[PDB]
Ligand binder design. Structure first.
Ligand code: SAH
Ligand code: SAH
Lengths: 249, 244
């Protein structure tokens, strides 16, 4: 017996981001596992279900909501948490495909390759299930941002650094590039850089109805971005943002 | 009273890469301009037409094949812009309508279309929109079932020439190289490097190879050369992971 586990990218919140390949993988599944709404409102558990429902035409596919484990904030904590998530998946798969021969899908925001834990958690399962893992690409927040601003990611023939807010705060401007895209940033970390010669293309809730886009010289639009971000957060209870920095010195 | 020009990403060769957003933009178009086959077989001009045919359902949308000018680079890009303008003038002479170009992968990533289209802003009453598509980076990682990044870590996306000119990019343990016609990972000391390589990713001809660079370099060279000999063209992409 063999479980085929598909990690299906579903894009950045625009329900039209889903690809035909993703639709096909949903329709081939015996079981689709989706997390229940929890504390993290940015998971948009309802939107995930909506996207699934808009395209699932296989009448036999089971769609099963499950409670995602909570990380122990009082803790290794991340490690135990990911272990617990794997255990939950393993229990769900075993309960619902007890013959252990079948196709199971998880729906992953954006693309599964990009700052997302699902693939590495799934690796834990390889030694406990007869398992093959497949990945279906989805639209990333990087591409959504560039499309919204109608800008290239790269300068002509030039490298690009993709990084995190914390990496920018710990190390400053990355070596060997004039373009940086920052993800996983909860604190507009570009504000800690020298603004000299930097242009920012910023977006919050990109490709969603709440989308806000701001562009300009970092020295001029930093406070505009801080305010827009805080406003969006106050009114919605959560915010996800991403930005591209272009250096011209 | 505007030409709305959509640059529609169409993915890496798999017709199923097309997003719903791309389908919608195709169906909203009055005109879709697609290049005829040329000397460069890697453009897969026929495949672009087929991917369009698989998704376009509006019977009033007109798919028009045009001769793409050939290449110095500035003049070539100017000539391409002039060709699109001539086609738009010819097929939408009232200059009010929706026009689309179908761009391999995502329009943001190592593709000249977006910057060439900028030339038309001053020539037409123009609004430009971009529809994202699956990139070759994502297709490669998906085919190998691997993460792009190490946990919480930076990633460098670069070209074959930048890799040759500067060596291992500073500040990263992960590099993805695009626009490389010659396996430029050979220009690096192989110690501690692992490669995840793919040619013709997400197409029927797909070849995937992974392993320590020293171990699989020649395997990759031969597989690449074999594809190129049998098909007349090849496109490859790879991710390098350093552990030192
Ligand atoms: N709709 C959206 N708008 C702005 N940023 C977004 C976003 N969705 C995701 N992000 C970015 O992605 C980070 C979550 S990590 C998950 C990334 C996802 N796998 C992808 O392919 O995009 C956020 O901190 C933010 O930087
Ligand atoms: N099917 C495929 N397999 C392997 N590499 C590919 C590919 N399609 C595109 N590429 C890569 O992309 C380069 C062309 S530049 C265009 C990139 C495209 N906009 C994108 O988003 O992917 C090639 O030199 C190669 O590095």
């Amino acid at each position: 017996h063999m479980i085929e586990l598909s990690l299906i990218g579903i894009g950045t919140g625009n329900p039209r981001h889903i690809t035909g390949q993703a639709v096909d993988a949903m329709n081939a599944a015996d079981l689709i596992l989706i997390p229940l709404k929890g504390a993290d409102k940015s998971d948009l558990a309802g939107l995930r279900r909506q996207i699934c429902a808009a395209h699932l035409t296989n009448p036999a596919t089971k769609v099963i909501d499950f409670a995602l484990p909570v990380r122990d904030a009082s803790n290794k904590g991340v490690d135990d948490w990911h272990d617990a998530i794997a255990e939950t998946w393993l229990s769900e798969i075993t309960a619902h495909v007890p013959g252990l021969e079948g196709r199971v899908a998880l729906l992953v925001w954006g693309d599964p390759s990009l700052y997302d834990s699902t693939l590495r958690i799934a690796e834990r399962l390889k030694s406990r299930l007869p398992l093959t893992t497949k990945v279906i690409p989805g639209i990333t927040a990087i591409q959504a941002l560039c499309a919204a601003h109608a800008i290239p990611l790269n300068d002509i023939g030039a490298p690009v650094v993709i990084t995190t807010g914390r990496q920018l705060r710990d190390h400053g401007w990355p070596a060997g590039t004039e373009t940086v895209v920052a993800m996983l940033d909860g604190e507009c970390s570009f504000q800690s850089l020298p603004p000299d010669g930097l242009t920012i293309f910023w977006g919050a809730c990109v490709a969603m109805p709440e989308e806000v886009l701001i562009r300009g010289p970092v020295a001029e639009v930093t406070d505009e971005i801080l305010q827009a971000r805080a406003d969006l957060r106050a009114r919605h209870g959560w915010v996800m943002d991403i930005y591209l920095l272009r250096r011209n010195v």
